[PDB]
Design an enzyme around this catalytic site. Structure first.
Site, PDB file in Angstrom:
ATOM      1  N   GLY A   1      21.650  73.898  32.290  1.00  0.00           N
ATOM      2  CA  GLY A   1      20.842  72.996  32.583  1.00  0.00           C
ATOM      3  C   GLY A   1      21.478  71.755  32.044  1.00  0.00           C
ATOM      4  O   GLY A   1      22.466  71.944  31.082  1.00  0.00           O
TER       5      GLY A   1
ATOM      6  N   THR B   1      17.122  74.826  30.686  1.00  0.00           N
ATOM      7  CA  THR B   1      17.410  76.101  30.845  1.00  0.00           C
ATOM      8  C   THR B   1      17.291  76.101  32.857  1.00  0.00           C
ATOM      9  O   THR B   1      15.921  76.099  32.894  1.00  0.00           O
ATOM     10  CB  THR B   1      17.142  77.149  30.136  1.00  0.00           C
TER      11      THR B   1
ATOM     12  N   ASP C   1      26.910  60.123  36.322  1.00  0.00           N
ATOM     13  CA  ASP C   1      27.525  61.185  36.010  1.00  0.00           C
ATOM     14  C   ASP C   1      28.033  62.098  37.111  1.00  0.00           C
ATOM     15  O   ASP C   1      27.982  63.287  37.061  1.00  0.00           O
ATOM     16  CB  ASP C   1      26.665  62.238  35.134  1.00  0.00           C
TER      17      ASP C   1
END
EC number: 2.7.11.1
Lengths: 289, 149
Positions: free
Chosen positions: A13, A17, A126
Site C-alpha cells: 500500500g 495494506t 507521484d
C-alpha cells in the site's frame, strides 16, 4: 469484511495494506486497501480520505477504479479493481525488454489516464513505475493518488517536496512553489525512457544536487534564453553548462526519431515548454496506433 | 473583506445564523476553534505555515453551507461537524502529506467522526473539485461568504 474473502496480502500500500480478495456475492476478484483508524501512525487516514475524494471523481479506463469504501471495525477499506502487477514488477518479468508496440501501448494508456486527470484539474505528483498497474489484458492504470491534489484555487504555494526524486522535474528540484500539469509530464518522460530502454531509471540521483546534474548532463543545461525564470527560482544555484548536443539514440534504443522527439518534448526543463498530455496524444508517435 | 480575519468572522456569523438552536453560540467561537487547530499543528511541527488563508476559508465555507444542518442541537455538535469539515479541508487542500486526527477530535465516539467524514465526502466530492476547476464557482462562493456579514 463480511462481503469480501481475503485471498493473499499482495500489496505495498502507499499508505496502508493491500489484499487480493473475492466478493462473496458476485465472485469477482478485487483489491482491498485497508487503513487502520485507531492509528499509531497519526496522519494516514488523511491521505486515504484525499485519495477517496479524488478517485470518486476520476472514472476512466486508465485510472485505477475505486469501486467502494467500507467502514467497519476500526478500519477503512477501499475496494479497487484488481490488477495483476505493476510496471516495476513487469520489468522484472520481461528482463526489462518490452516490444516497441508495448512501449507505445503503455505510453499511450499512461497519457490517456494522465490527460484525463489534468482535464479534471488533478495533479498526480507521484508518477513512477510502481504506481502504474498492468492487467493481463495489457491495460495500464495510473494508481496511488495519495500525493495527488486538485488544482485551480488561488494558493500562495504548493509543496516542492513532491514526486519521488528520480521522477521530479528541474523546476521543482530548484524549489518552484508553483507548478501546473507540467509536473506529471516530466515524470511521464522519465517513465517513457525506462520503457524504451531496459526498464531502469534514467536519472537515479542520490540527492537533489546529483539529480539536477544527471538531468543536465544528458539534456544540456538550460540557458537564460530557454528558461528566463530559472535563475530566480528559490533554490536555484549555478550548474555547469553541459552541452545540448548529447545524442539520446543509445539512451532509448527502442525508439525511432519520432519517439525520441516525443521524449524530448516531455523532458523539457522549462515547465512552460513541456508538452501537455492532450498534445502528446496527437504526436505522430501514436498516429499508426 | 479579503483578509483571513474578516472572512473567518463572516463564516462565524454564518454559522450563528444557520444554527438557530444554539442560543449562546458566539460568532467568535468557530473562529477560536479553527485558529486553535491551525496554531496547534504549527507549534507541534505538523506544518511550517498556517493552513488558514482566504482561499481555504472559502473552501471550508463551501463545505459548511451544504453539510452543517440548521438543526444542530448543541455547540459541541457544531464544533464536531465544523472540525470534520476542517479536517477534510486540510486533507484535500493542505500542503502536507497528512494531518493527525487529535486536534480535530472533540467527540468520544471516533466511529461517528469517520462516518461523518465519509458522508461529507459522498455529498461534497464533486464540489470540492469543481471549486478548484471553475474560477467562476470559486468567485461565487467567495462573494457569498463576503455577503454573510
Amino acid at each position: 469484511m463480511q462481503k469480501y474473502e481475503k485471498l493473499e496480502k499482495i500489496g505495498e500500500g502507499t499508505y496502508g495494506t493491500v489484499f487480493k480478495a473475492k466478493n462473496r456475492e458476485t465472485h469477482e476478484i478485487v483489491a482491498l486497501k485497508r487503513v487502520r483508524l485507531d492509528d499509531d501512525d497519526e496522519g494516514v487516514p488523511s491521505s486515504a480520505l484525499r485519495e477517496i475524494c479524488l478517485l470518486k471523481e476520476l472514472k476512466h479506463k486508465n485510472i485505477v477504479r475505486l469501486h467502494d469504501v467500507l467502514h467497519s471495525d476500526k478500519k477503512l477499506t477501499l475496494v479497487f479493481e484488481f490488477c495483476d502487477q505493476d510496471l516495476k514488477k513487469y520489468f522484472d518479468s520481461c528482463n526489462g525488454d518490452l516490444d516497441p508496440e508495448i512501449v507505445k501501448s503503455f505510453l499511450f494508456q499512461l497519457l490517456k489516464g494522465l490527460g484525463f486527470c489534468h482535464s479534471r484539474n488533478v495533479l498526480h505528483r507521484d508518477l513512477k513505475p510502481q504506481n502504474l498497474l498492468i492487467n493481463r489484458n495489457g491495460e495500464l492504470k495510473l494508481a496511488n493518488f495519495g500525493l495527488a491534489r486538485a488544482f485551480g484555487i488561488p494558493v500562495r504555494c504548493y509543496s516542492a517536496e513532491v514526486v519521488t526524486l528520480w521522477y521530479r522535474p528541474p523546476d521543482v528540484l530548484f524549489g518552484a512553489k508553483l507548478y501546473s500539469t507540467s509536473i506529471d509530464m516530466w515524470s511521464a518522460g522519465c517513465i517513457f525512457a525506462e520503457l524504451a530502454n531496459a526498464g531502469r531509471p534514467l536519472f537515479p540521483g542520490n540527492d537533489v544536487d546529483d539529480q539536477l546534474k544527471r538531468i543536465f548532463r544528458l539534456l544540456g543545461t538550460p540557458t537564460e534564453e530557454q528558461w528566463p525564470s530559472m535563475t530566480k527560482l528559490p533554490d536555484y544555484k549555478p550548474y555547469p553548462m553541459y552541452p545540448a548536443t548529447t545524442s539520446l539514440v543509445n539512451v532509448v534504443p527502442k525508439l525511432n526519431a519520432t519517439g525520441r522527439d516525443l521524449l524530448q518534448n516531455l523532458l523539457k526543463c522549462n515547465p512552460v515548454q513541456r508538452i501537455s498530455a492532450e498534445e502528446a496524444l496527437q504526436h505522430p508517435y501514436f498516429s499508426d496506433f | 473583506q479579503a483578509s483571513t480575519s474578516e472572512l473567518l468572522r463572516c463564516l462565524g456569523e454564518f454559522l450563528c445564523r444557520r444554527c438557530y438552536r444554539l442560543k449562546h453560540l458566539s460568532p467568535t467561537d468557530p473562529v477560536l476553534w479553527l485558529r486553535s487547530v491551525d496554531r496547534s499543528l504549527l507549534l507541534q511541527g505538523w506544518q511550517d505555515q498556517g493552513f488558514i488563508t482566504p482561499a481555504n476559508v472559502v473552501f471550508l465555507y463551501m463545505l459548511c453551507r451544504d453539510v452543517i444542518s440548521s438543526e444542530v442541537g448543541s455547540d459541541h455538535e457544531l464544533q464536531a461537524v465544523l472540525l470534520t469539515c476542517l479536517y477534510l479541508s486540510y486533507s484535500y487542500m493542505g500542503n502536507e502529506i497528512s494531518y493527525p486526527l487529535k486536534p480535530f477530535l472533540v467527540e468520544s465516539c471516533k466511529e461517528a467522526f469517520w462516518d461523518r467524514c465519509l458522508s461529507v465526502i459522498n455529498l461534497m466530492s464533486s464540489k470540492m473539485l469543481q471549486i478548484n476547476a471553475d474560477p467562476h464557482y470559486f468567485t461565487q462562493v467567495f462573494s457569498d461568504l463576503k455577503n454573510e456579514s
